[PDB]
Ligand binder design. Structure first.
Ligand code: CLA
Ligand code: CLA
Ligand code: CLA
Ligand code: CLA
Ligand code: CLA
Ligand code: CLA
Ligand code: CLA
Ligand code: CLA
Ligand code: CLA
Ligand code: LHG
Lengths: 75, 80, 139, 741, 40, 146, 143, 40
């Protein structure tokens, strides 16, 4: 009775990509300092983010995607 | 209360006076030492007997001694 | 009478007790040049008012410890603090300094008390004064 | 491109100061005049705060000394590995773990101590070891002595590395104070790069090395035929045939199809039937999850890119109505005073060590650890004593901080000020609860003792009489027994069989069985509560009243370590915080002694024993705990006198070294009483007479001998006392546990 | 160096060196001639 | 020391087993095992989970002495200032408690003086010493021969 | 919402105003107790106090005493309660005898020699009454 | 709690007085005397 996980499928990619987008949207409204440290080459496409902010929100996106995918695969 | 006695070997170094936390000791002019001052104990009714004055005396043995006698509220250091 | 605004303090459980209202208490007054913070001898820290400050304590040792702290722990040295004893009947007895001059320095006019005219090795033997109500140092 | 900021060559490397002892202290620098100068020298050495007023220099000294202690620990570990490689029967024990006693110390026969080299099985003579290194090594995938030798060599190399690191990072390139104060970056690196990375590396070791070797070992494969660990890496088919999921490679990992790895990453729970230890797959998933959690946690504090919370902001934002300023001002305290950090870390580490000792025995991780009763008892007692000492040290260094580094100006109406402002209520309520616990716990024992002595067993506090059933503990045990069913559905069995379930037995001995709780367990647990609350009372009174009190209003001006304030005020002996620590050491000793005694007797009486092929379990002491541990006479007769036979009758055998030590323990204790019961004036007068004697013959020493100071006398008394008592208990426990099969 | 020489000559190093020498003498003598209860 | 020597020698004499004392009295472990551990078997069994015999009072007094002896250590080791401060806290607690301020002490409670503490600790110590040895001696001799 | 301050607005008094030491409910409940009630004579105060302090003393000996499993359980509890009340009355009388030998004022009628004597007598009577009524409730038949 | 000696009823009344009555009586008398502020 091991919990059931999913083999890689386009649905998994879409789900966690939605998670990434929502994580970025949430991070833009919550991070106190968003333009400190090493910056992007062209911040216009990143909404005034530095490298740290982009990496943090992307890591948060992968984390939320992993959690959501595993939870959905369980049920 | 306790009895604080000062003998004639005092040299007027004031260490006993400064070490007293309850302000029992004092300095009064004298003529037996270079400093021309000797310690005095005019307020022995406030002394508790912590022996800091004896601890601070630099002379051989002590020019100041504290003999613990009748215990009062002030001597016993009671705040209640 | 005693005049002064109490320092800004939140209070504590280490303050006075029934002895102050039944036996006696003590008071200390001092003029602070500027408002600052000082350690309560009963615990904690209290902000003292600019100008004249008045404070009640339970023992003379606590008042003198506070006075030493005032004299030694602030760059503008506080030298004008006065310590009185407050009786329940309302009588105020002025204690420290005795004559306006600190006891650490010699001042003309004081009378020598408790001074013996002999070395400590010249005290009489107990057997010579036994059955009397005295002690070798007392004679 | 870093926050690194160091000073180059601040302290030259020279040997002159080696020849001038006491160089650090101005008081001891000018030279000795009395013998006290010696005792001060060894006492104020590693107190860097008093030597200099520079925080940066103190921090640099602390960093270097910490490197030194790391080097010492590395030397100790490498020595353990070397002595287990050369002078041990680990290779012999590995083939037959259930018939050969572990042994790694061998004695030279010189004056008859060769009798200590008793037979440990398999034709090997040596001292049986209870440190449990053999089980750790087997669980670590050790099969050959050469591997242990290589580990010892690596440990020596790393110890040399740490020594050189200390020398470089102090005498050559010393970090600046601002570098030391990057607490956010320090926590980031230590939470992620140390705990998370270390746990991930250990999980990798366990999966890629420990699992195949232990799977082969438990399956009956001879230790000499098991492939070397690197063979599994070099030949992945060997790993795949042991675990089929390894045939799928790392593809299921990055695709989040983690269930593929279910065969070797399980949630079994319970214990391995073959060895009696935990499943290695459970530990693998455990350490992997721990690594993931710690690596996630290590990114919390913002360091250099503005992403992450700031500790000062969190501290200053949590403040409520009852606290006024709340946690404001603590950040400056903990970033400028080493003593506060030392206190907090010591308390947490001591509690963690007690947790370790409490959690190892109930679920033994290492193979065959449960089947070796001596190893269980030794490990539990050892780490318990370590934890107790660390907690007492926390209570000490907290008072040290309060005396020295506390500044009232920056702590106005914060949490510390309101500590100092309602401390009297705290101490009074704590004193009341201590007295109440002492009465309603120890008076129960005394009442039972009197009822039994009066021939009234029906009036006792016993399971056959008035009963004090720990209903809450029994209920939580029942809840944890039902956890594998529905509350933790993906668990095969319980976390530990101590809560309940089946009796796991290895060979002919019980590895772990349910531990029921009755009236005796209730009474002993509440006795533990009473002792712990009393020790907390002593240490907390020491910390809170360190600055001053009603009796002494300027205690902080005297310092942390002063003997008294004189016979005034009726007598002011032992008012410093140091004396509070000295008093709390005894109470910690008493509490830990009761704890280890309870553990030992309960384990012997209701847990350990032997299993017959019929399935019946015969315990070591035939289950006399439930009926004897309710009276003090029961503890005296059925525990001390009864179980001391194996140590008193140890003469003429290999266990004789214990019996000797047992008597040794009974000696120093008594010796300590000649420091604790007396004072230094009498000894000073006696030394005066002896000095006259040595003066008569013109042999008087230039260094004038003086009797020990009051603080030093108390310290010597408590030290020799604890040494004697702990040595007594250690000898008793070892001689008892090495004789109950 | 001079400092190393001075450090080696401090009291603890001297007393422990003398104790080690004496202990070695006694242990070796008892290795070669044990059970010496009296002069025969 | 004196009484232990006398008692062990005479136990050997009375039982006729002088050999036990003669062999085992030359090393301290024999004193520990053949005298203390051996002769305590019946004393501690004065009252038992299974019953009570006539030595019960002696076992109870044996434990009583082992307790008073330890109690003396509290006065012998811990000194005045700690208890004085604790009494300060207790005085504050009593004075601040409602329904208890109606009752006040006639004499201000203070901690025992230094010399008084030494005397009290020595008294508890000596009483425990005497009671413990008397109980052990009487119980051992009564069980063996009485 | 600084609900915790000094006792009676006096920071130099060793006490603090806390939600249980100076709350309005606390003062209202305490002041209405028989000891602290307004206008009550010491005899009536002692009677009222002894009522409860003797009523609640029937319990422990009844449920745990040596006769707790006997036909005489409640009688034993009653006897123990009565003896303890007698000892308490003796202690109260001694305290009143030794505490008010100085001045005999009138600031508090309870804190006086005559007032304390009346209080102790009322306490004795109330303790007897409370113990007896508790026994009457608890005892079955035996009438 | 009976005995076969002559006048077995005596300890039934004597022991309580020595146990409760006499101790309490002297206890209170001494307590009153030591706090008697009549003189000095
Ligand atoms: C809609 C999306 C979704 C869905 C359907 C699920 C569904 C599920 N998740 Mg899940 N998850 C999600 C999103 C989702 N998750 C996200 C976004 C994350 C990232 C944060 C996670 C992270 C996550 C973890 C880490 C775990 C799950 C688990 C589970 C499963 C069991 C949870 C449960 O109720 O049992 C548990 C029910 C309980 C009552 C247990 C709660 C009691 C705990 C142990 C107390 C812990 C106290 C703790 C120390 C306090 C915190 C301290 C400090 C932070 C203040 C369940 C199928 C669990 C699993 O794998 O189950 C097999 C599991 O371990 N999820
Ligand atoms: C294909 C790449 C791509 C493109 C075309 C856009 C396009 C856009 N982004 Mg964007 N973004 C991207 C990738 C991209 N994003 C990624 C990878 C991140 C995460 C690092 C972000 C994070 C981001 C933020 C945080 C914000 C935008 C915003 C915007 C809009 C205005 C900024 C601009 O350049 O015009 C615009 C529609 C801004 C917006 O929508 O205005 C409110 C804004 O605030 N983006
Ligand atoms: C990943 C980064 C990292 C790691 C692993 C550590 C680890 C440690 N730090 Mg630390 N530290 C770091 C970053 C790190 N620090 C940063 C960035 C700062 C500046 C803010 C500090 C500032 C600092 C101070 C001020 C102090 C420490 C101390 C310590 C030690 C505490 C003792 C201990 O845990 O025992 C466990 C011991 C071990 C696990 C032994 C490890 C031996 C070496 C040093 C580990 C090297 C591993 C390295 C990653 C290469 C191995 C990888 C691979 C080849 C296997 C510990 C070794 C204390 C100390 O003095 O120790 C020296 C101390 O007081 N740290
Ligand atoms: C620091 C930890 C660590 C390290 C160094 C390794 C190292 C290795 N693993 Mg490994 N592994 C680890 C943790 C670790 N593992 C953990 C925690 C798991 C559980 C998810 C696995 C599961 C795993 C599988 C399933 C496989 C490896 C394999 C490998 C090998 C090839 C992969 C590689 O290096 O390129 C990338 C290599 C020796 C592969 C192999 O053939 O090794 C025998 C392979 O098939 N590993
Ligand atoms: C990580 C642990 C740690 C660290 C770094 C420190 C650091 C420090 N402590 Mg601290 N302490 C600790 C744990 C720790 N302590 C614990 C656990 C306790 C409780 C026992 C204490 C109790 C304590 C006190 C009471 C005092 C300090 C003091 C000090 C300061 C240096 C003075 C000193 O002790 O050196 C000198 C060290 C010694 C003289 C120790 C040598 C003698 C030991 C006791 C012998 C031990 C015998 C051994 C266990 C067995 C040998 C058997 C034999 C037969 C061979 C320094 C800040 C002192 C201080 O105030 O400085 C500010 C001080 O007075 N500490
Ligand atoms: C009679 C012949 C003889 C023989 C065969 C040995 C043989 C040995 N001795 Mg030895 N010894 C001897 C005479 C002898 N000794 C004498 C006469 C003395 C008195 C000075 C010593 C004092 C001595 C000490 C103090 C030690 C040895 C040690 C040793 C062992 C290590 C090797 C060694 O000598 O270097 C080491 C030798 C020394 C450190 C001192 C040698 C002093 C010379 C011989 C003079 C070795 C088995 C060592 C050992 O077993 O290590 C634990 C050790 O610690 N011996
Ligand atoms: C066996 C020896 C012994 C005993 C019994 C005690 C007892 C006590 N110590 Mg103690 N102590 C001892 C040795 C001992 N100490 C030693 C050696 C040291 C040196 C380190 C200390 C250091 C020490 C400190 C530093 C502290 C204590 C504290 C306490 C008290 C804790 C409250 C308590 O236990 O409940 C009440 C007492 C008991 C349960 C003891 C048994 C009483 C019996 C069961 C009752 C008798 C029944 C009845 C009254 C008899 C009627 C007959 C009539 C004639 C009276 C208690 C009075 C603490 C304290 O002040 O209290 C919080 C405290 O802070 N002790
Ligand atoms: C050792 C502690 C102890 C013990 C064994 C008892 C035992 C008892 N109490 Mg009791 N009690 C105690 C402490 C104790 N009390 C304390 C500390 C207080 C507060 C001062 C009370 C207040 C109290 C009240 C107010 C009452 C009891 C009553 C009772 C009896 C019935 C239980 C009950 O609740 O009746 C439940 C009610 C009934 C059975 C209805 C009877 C009509 C029982 C004999 C009751 C009693 O005896 O009344 C006859 C009762 O009314 N108790
Ligand atoms: C000092 C001598 C002494 C001692 C220790 C005892 C001891 C005892 N007697 Mg006893 N007795 C004694 C002399 C003594 N007797 C004499 C001389 C008489 C003849 C009048 C009696 C007549 C007597 C009776 C009739 C009874 C006892 C009983 C008892 C037992 C109960 C406790 C008790 O004494 O109270 C009760 C007994 C008395 C109050 C008798 C009066 C004591 C004598 C007359 C005065 C002794 C004063 C003493 C020297 C004061 C010392 C001061 C010191 C504390 C500083 C106890 C074993 C009772 C018993 O057997 O219970 C089992 C019992 O019923 N005794
Ligand atoms: C569960 C097992 C059985 C245990 C039952 C015992 C319960 C007895 C007491 C109830 C617990 C109440 C905690 C509320 C306390 C709480 O909620 O604090 C809240 C309050 C602070 O509230 P604020 O919102 O102002 O807090 C701001 C915070 O962010 C910190 O600044 O703290 C105080 O009022 C401190 C006063 C506590 C003084 C009483 C301390 C009691 C000490 C004894 C504790 C006994 C239980 C010990 C066993 C663990």
């Amino acid at each position: 009775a091991v919990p059931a996980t999913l083999s890689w499928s386009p649905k998994v990619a879409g789900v966690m990509i939605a998670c990434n987008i929502l994580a970025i949207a949430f991070g833009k409204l919550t991070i106190k300092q968003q333009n400190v440290g090493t910056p992007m080459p062209s911040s216009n496409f990143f909404g005034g983010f530095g490298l740290g902010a982009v990496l943090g929100t992307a890591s948060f996106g992968h984390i939320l995607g992993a959690g959501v995918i595993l939870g959905l695969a369980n049920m | 209360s306790h009895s604080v006695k000062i003998y004639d070997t005092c040299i007027g170094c004031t260490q006993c006076v400064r070490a007293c936390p309850l302000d029992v000791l004092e300095m009064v002019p004298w003529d037996g030492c270079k400093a021309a001052q000797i310690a005095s104990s005019p307020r022995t009714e406030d002394c508790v007997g912590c022996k800091r004055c004896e601890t601070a005396c630099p002379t051989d043995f002590l020019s100041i001694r504290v003999y613990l006698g009748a215990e009062t509220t002030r001597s016993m250091g009671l705040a209640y | 009478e005693l005049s002064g605004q109490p320092p800004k303090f939140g209070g504590s459980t280490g303050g006075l007790l029934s002895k102050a209202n039944r036996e006696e208490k003590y008071a200390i007054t001092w003029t602070s040049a500027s408002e600052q913070v000082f350690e309560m001898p009963t615990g904690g820290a209290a902000i003292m008012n600019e100008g004249e400050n008045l404070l009640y304590l339970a023992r003379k040792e606590q008042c003198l410890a506070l006075g030493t702290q005032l004299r030694t722990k602030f760059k503008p040295k506080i030298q004008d603090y006065k310590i009185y004893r407050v009786y329940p009947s309302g009588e105020v007895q002025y204690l420290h300094p005795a004559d306006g001059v600190f006891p650490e320095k010699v001042n003309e006019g004081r009378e020598a008390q408790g001074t013996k005219t002999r070395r400590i090795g010249q005290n009489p033997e107990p057997v010579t004064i036994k059955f009397s109500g005295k002690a070798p140092y007392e004679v | 491109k870093a926050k690194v900021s160091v000073d180059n060559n601040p302290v030259p490397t020279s040997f002159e100061k080696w020849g001038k002892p006491g160089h650090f202290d101005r008081t001891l620098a000018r030279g000795p005049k009395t013998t006290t100068w010696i005792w001060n020298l060894h006492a104020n050495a590693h107190d860097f705060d008093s030597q200099t007023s520079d925080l940066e220099d103190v921090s640099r000294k602390i960093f270097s000394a910490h490197f030194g202690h790391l080097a010492v620990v590395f030397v100790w570990l490498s020595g353990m590995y070397f002595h287990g490689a050369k002078f041990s029967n680990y290779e012999g024990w590995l083939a037959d773990p259930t018939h050969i006693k572990p042994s790694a110390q061998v004695v030279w026969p010189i004056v008859g101590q060769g009798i200590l080299n008793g037979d440990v099985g398999g034709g090997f003579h040596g001292i049986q070891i209870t440190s449990g290194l053999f089980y750790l090594w087997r669980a670590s995938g050790f099969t050959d002595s050469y591997q242990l030798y290589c580990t010892a060599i690596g440990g020596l190399v790393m110890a040399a590395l740490m020594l050189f690191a200390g020398w470089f990072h102090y005498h050559v390139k010393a970090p600046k104070l601002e570098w030391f104060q990057n607490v956010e970056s320090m926590m980031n690196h230590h939470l992620a790069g140390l705990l998370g990375l270390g746990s991930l590396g250990w999980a990798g070791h366990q999966i890629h090395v420990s699992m195949p070797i232990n799977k082969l070992l438990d399956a009956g494969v001879a230790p000499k035929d098991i492939p070397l660990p690197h063979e599994f890496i070099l030949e992945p088919s060997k790993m795949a045939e042991l675990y089929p999921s390894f045939a799928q490679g790392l593809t299921p990992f990055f695709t989040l199809n983690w269930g593929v790895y279910s065969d070797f990453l399980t949630f079994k729970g319970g214990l391995n039937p073959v060895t009696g230890g935990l499943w290695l797959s459970d530990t693998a998933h455990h350490h992997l999850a721990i690594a993931v959690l710690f690596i996630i946690a290590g990114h919390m504090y913002r360091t250099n890119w503005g992403i992450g919370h700031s500790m000062k902001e969190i501290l200053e934002a949590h403040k409520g109505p009852f606290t006024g300023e709340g946690h404001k001002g603590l950040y400056e305290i903990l970033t400028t005073s080493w003593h506060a950090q030392l206190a907090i870390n010591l308390a947490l580490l001591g509690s963690l060590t007690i947790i370790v000792a409490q959690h190892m025995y109930a679920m033994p991780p290492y193979p065959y650890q449960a089947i070796d009763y001596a190893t269980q008892l030794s490990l539990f007692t050892h780490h318990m004593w370590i934890g107790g000492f660390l907690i007492v040290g926390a209570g000490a260094h907290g008072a040290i901080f309060m005396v020295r580094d506390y500044d009232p100006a920056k702590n106005v109406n914060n949490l510390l000020d309101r500590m100092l402002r309602h401390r009297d209520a705290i101490i009074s309520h704590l004193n009341w609860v201590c007295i109440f616990l002492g009465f309603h716990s120890f008076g129960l024992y005394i009442h039972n003792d009197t009822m039994r002595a009066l021939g009234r067993p029906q009036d006792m506090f016993s399971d056959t009489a008035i009963q004090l059933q720990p209903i809450f503990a029994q209920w939580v045990q029942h809840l944890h027994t039902l956890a594998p069913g529905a509350t933790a559905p993906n668990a095969l069995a319980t976390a530990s069989y101590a809560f309940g379930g089946e009796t796991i037995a290895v060979a002919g001995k019980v590895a772990m069985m349910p531990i029921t709780l009755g009236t005796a367990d209730f009474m002993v647990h509440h006795i533990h509560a009473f002792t712990i609350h009393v020790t907390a009372l002593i240490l907390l009174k020491g910390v809170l009243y360190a600055r001053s009190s009603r009796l002494v209003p300027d205690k902080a001006n005297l310092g942390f370590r002063f003997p008294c304030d004189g016979p005034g005020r009726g007598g002011t002996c032992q008012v410093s915080g140091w004396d509070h620590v000295f008093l709390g050491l005894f109470w910690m000793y008493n509490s830990l002694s009761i704890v280890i005694f309870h553990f030992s007797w309960k384990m012997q009486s209701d847990v350990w024993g032997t299993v017959s092929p019929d399935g019946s379990v015969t315990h070591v002491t035939l289950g006399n705990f439930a009926q004897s541990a309710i009276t003090i006479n029961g503890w005296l007769r059925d525990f001390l006198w009864a179980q001391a036979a194996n140590v008193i009758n140890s003469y003429g055998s290999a266990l004789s070294a214990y019996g000797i030590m047992f008597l040794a323990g009974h000696f120093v204790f008594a010796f300590s009483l000649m420091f604790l019961f007396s004072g230094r004036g009498y000894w000073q007068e006696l030394i005066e007479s002896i000095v006259w004697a040595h003066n008569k013959l013109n042999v008087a020493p230039a260094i004038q001998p003086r009797a020990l100071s009051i603080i030093q006398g108390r310290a010597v008394g408590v030290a020799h006392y604890l040494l004697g008592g702990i040595v007594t208990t250690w000898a008793f426990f070892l001689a008892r546990s090495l004789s109950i099969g | 160096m001079d400092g190393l020489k001075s450090f080696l000559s401090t009291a603890p190093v001297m007393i422990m060196a003398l104790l080690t020498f004496t202990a070695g003498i006694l242990i070796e003598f008892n290795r070669f001639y044990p059970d010496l209860l009296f002069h025969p | 020391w004196l009484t232990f020597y006398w008692h062990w020698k005479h136990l050997g004499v009375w039982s006729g087993n002088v050999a036990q004392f003669n062999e085992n009295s030359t090393y301290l472990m024999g004193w520990f095992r053949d005298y203390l551990w051996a002769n305590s078997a019946q004393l501690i069994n004065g009252y038992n989970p299974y019953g009570v015999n006539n030595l019960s009072v002696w076992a109870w007094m044996f434990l009583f002495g082992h307790l008073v002896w330890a109690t003396g250590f509290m006065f012998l080791i811990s000194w005045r200032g700690y208890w004085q401060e604790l009494i300060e806290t207790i005085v504050w607690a009593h004075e601040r408690t409602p329904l208890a301020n109606l009752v006040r002490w006639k004499d201000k409670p203070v901690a025992l003086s230094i010399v008084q503490a030494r005397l009290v600790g020595l008294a508890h110590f000596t009483v425990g010493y005497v009671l413990t040895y008397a109980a052990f001696l009487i119980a051992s001799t009564a069980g063996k021969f009485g | 919402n600084q609900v915790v301050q000094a006792y009676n607005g006096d920071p130099f008094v060793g006490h603090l105003s806390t939600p249980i030491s100076d709350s309005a409910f606390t003062r209202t409940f305490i002041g209405n107790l028989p000891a602290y009630r307004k206008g009550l004579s010491p005899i009536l105060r002692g009677l009222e106090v002894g009522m409860a302090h003797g009523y609640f003393l029937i319990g422990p000996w009844t449920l745990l005493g040596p006769l707790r499993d006997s036909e005489y359980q409640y009688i034993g509890g009653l006897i123990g309660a009565l003896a303890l009340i007698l000892v308490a009355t003796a202690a109260l009388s001694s305290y009143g005898l030794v505490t008010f030998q100085g001045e005999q004022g009138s600031g508090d009628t309870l804190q006086t020699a005559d007032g304390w004597s009346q209080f102790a007598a009322g306490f004795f009577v109330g303790g007897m009454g409370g113990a007896f009524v508790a026994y009457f409730l608890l005892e079955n038949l035996s009438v | 709690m009976d005995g076969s000696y002559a006048a077995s009823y005596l300890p039934w009344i004597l022991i309580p007085m020595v146990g409760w009555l006499f101790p309490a009586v002297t206890m209170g008398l001494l307590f009153i005397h030591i706090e008697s502020e009549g003189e000095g």
